[PDB]
């Protein structure tokens, strides 16, 4: 009875791991495509599956971090959203923390995305007229040339400054979408998606 | 591009169907075992997966009804829980409605469970001192000998009447657990559980 219960629990853990990879792939695809409602529903499903998982491999922690990173990026302009226990941390600051924690290559693309999130974390505060909050986000992030231009823009209250149009929110999203394409290629071969693709193909 | 998007959406629908069957099996097992916290977490996951499914086969609608039925039975004593748009309907009354909708055999066990839910729908109102609500649940359900004993118990305010000890909440749960064992046997062969069981066995 206890041996059967144990084997069942191990099988549920295997299946939850397969569901996590599939939901991550679906979340990545919805983000890349701009399917806002599918992203919201898929995120809700990923969150619930994650609460049913206890022990995680390094690969599963990376998968969860990718889901959490895209969720904060999708909420980047929602300044009322609180992703951390410290209520002062904005969504883009929370995405920046996860970006620096993922076990991944620090290639040129990694650093470009990092710097684009930093500029936009300040930009989104300025665009909402939250000038003192922009300065507080600046101090938390920064923790010379790039740093000093940003402090000058904050002090002038230059909300629609051309610097934010050159390193825009759209540019940040496009660079992140290039990274998402690589996650999509890497996870397209995971168990659940492969088996489901084989079913659809066999009916064609 | 549209052909690929279409094939991907079909594969996501296949995978969501496999996840629904697996989550139903896990929910049934947690209910049978009395694993309250695992039931709560599994229910949250089933709800989210169901919102990501659009077209349902007759088999998938039956699977969803089984999940909804067990959720209302688990909440049978939570008289503040509102499962229907009509706020007057109690959780056991909502379970009774689903029980009468499932495409299943009306064998002796089906009717015994039905009558046990009817008695307990009244019993739970009486036990909370909600005498007028017990009479209202009675009128909505009933909708001669069984009916008249119940109306007499309600009018006397006989909360701890021996009739409710003979056709108890425990007796209702045990009969429902016998039905759950049959659902467990039937869904143990579904794709995701079978594949996960094969993985665990191969590591022994
Ligand atoms: C709201 C939140 N969603 N999430 C989240 C977590 C895992 C997968 C997808 C999303 C957070 O961490 C906070
Ligand atoms: C609360 C509720 N949970 N549910 C539910 C639905 C599907 C699966 C599991 C549970 C309801 O219908 C209302
Ligand atoms: Ca805020
Ligand atoms: Ca109530």
Residue B46 burial (C-beta neighbours within 10 Å; 0-12, 13-18, 19+) = buried
Chain B touched by A8 (CB under 8 Å): yes
Resolution (A): 1.9
Mark B76-98 as b/e (b = at least 16 C-beta within 10 Å): beebeeebeeeeebbbbbbbbeb
> What is the sign, positive or negative, of the torsion defined by CA atoms of B178, B179, B183, B186?
positive
Cβ distance B7 to A52 less than 8 Å, yes or no, reads no
Q: Which of B22, B33, B49 sits opposite A45 (nearest CB)?
A: B49
Which residue shows structure tokens 């149009």?
A: A165
Q: Please indicate whether residue A98, judged by its CB atom, sits closer than 6 Å to ligand 1.
A: no
Topology adopted by domain B2-142+144-202: 1.25.40
- Chain A, 150 to 189: residues with Cβ < 8 Å from chain B are none
Domain range summary for chain B, segments of one domain joined by +: 2-142+144-202
Q: Which of B15, B38, B200 sits opposite A14 (nearest CB)?
A: B200
- How would DSSP label each residue in A157-176? T-TT-HHHHHS-HHHHHHHH
CA–CA separation, B167 and B49 (whole Å) = 36
Neighbours of B74 (CB within 10 A): 20
Chain A touched by B97 (CB under 8 Å): no
Q: Which of B11, B29, B199 sits opposite A196 (nearest CB)?
A: B11
Q: Please indicate whether residue A46, judged by its CB atom, sits closer than 6 Å to ligand 1.
A: yes
Q: Which of A5, A11, A22 sits opposite B196 (nearest CB)?
A: A11
CA–CA separation, B196 and B198 (whole Å) = 5
Chain B CB contacts of A53 below 8 Å: none
First and final C-alpha spacing in chain A = 44
Separation of CA B186 and ligand 4 centre (Å):
35
Chain B touched by A61 (CB under 8 Å): no
Beta-carbon contacts of A95 under 8 Å, excluding residues fewer than 6 positions away, are A69, A72, A73, A76, A117
CA–CA separation, A156 and A169 (whole Å) = 21
Query: To the nearest whole angstrom, how far is the Cα of B8 from the nearest Cα of chain A?
Result: 8
Neighbours of B33 (CB within 10 A): 14
Query: To the nearest whole angstrom, how far is the Cα of B81 from the nearest Cα of chain A?
Result: 21
> What 3-state DSSP class applies to A156?
helix
Helix, strand, coil distribution of chain A in percent, nearest 5: 75, 0, 25
Cβ distance A10 to B48 less than 8 Å, yes or no, reads no
Q: At what angle do helices A191-202 and B191-202 cross, to 10 degrees?
A: 130
CA closest to A2 among chain B residues: B33
Test mutation, B15, B22, B42, B203, chain A, max A CBs within 10 A = B15
CA–CA separation, B150 and B144 (whole Å) = 10
Phi, psi at B104, each rounded to 5°: -150, 165
- Tokens representing B22? 């697996």
- Tokens representing B164? 């409710």
Neighbours of A44 (CB within 10 A): 18
Mark A150-183 as b/e (b = at least 16 C-beta within 10 Å): beebbeeeeeebeebeebebeebbebbeebbeeb
Chain B CB contacts of A201 below 8 Å: 7
Q: Give ∠ CA B17-B185-B19 in degrees, rounded to 5.
A: 15
């Amino acid at each position: 009875e206890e041996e059967d219960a144990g084997l069942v629990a191990e099988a549920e853990a295997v299946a939850a791991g397969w569901m996590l990879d599939f939901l991550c792939l679906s979340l990545c695809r919805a983000f890349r495509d701009g399917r806002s409602e599918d992203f919201r529903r898929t995120r809700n499903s990923a969150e619930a599956i994650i609460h049913g998982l206890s022990s995680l491999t390094a690969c599963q922690l990376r998968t969860i971090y990718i889901c959490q990173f895209l969720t904060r990026i999708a909420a980047g302009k929602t300044l009322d959203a609180q992703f951390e226990n410290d209520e002062r941390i904005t969504p883009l600051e929370s995405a920046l923390m996860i970006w620096g924690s993922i076990e991944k290559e620090h290639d040129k693309l990694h650093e470009e995305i990092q710097n684009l999130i930093k500029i936009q974390a300040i930009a989104v505060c300025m665009e909402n007229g939250n000038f003192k909050e922009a300065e507080e986000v600046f101090e938390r992030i920064f923790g010379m040339p790039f740093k000093s231009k940003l402090l000058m823009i904050i002090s002038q209250k230059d909300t629609f400054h051309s610097f934010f149009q050159h390193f825009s929110y759209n540019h940040m999203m496009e660079k992140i979408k290039s990274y998402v394409n690589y996650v999509l290629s890497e996870k397209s071969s995971t168990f659940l998606m492969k088996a489901a693709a084989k079913v659809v193909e066999s009916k064609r």
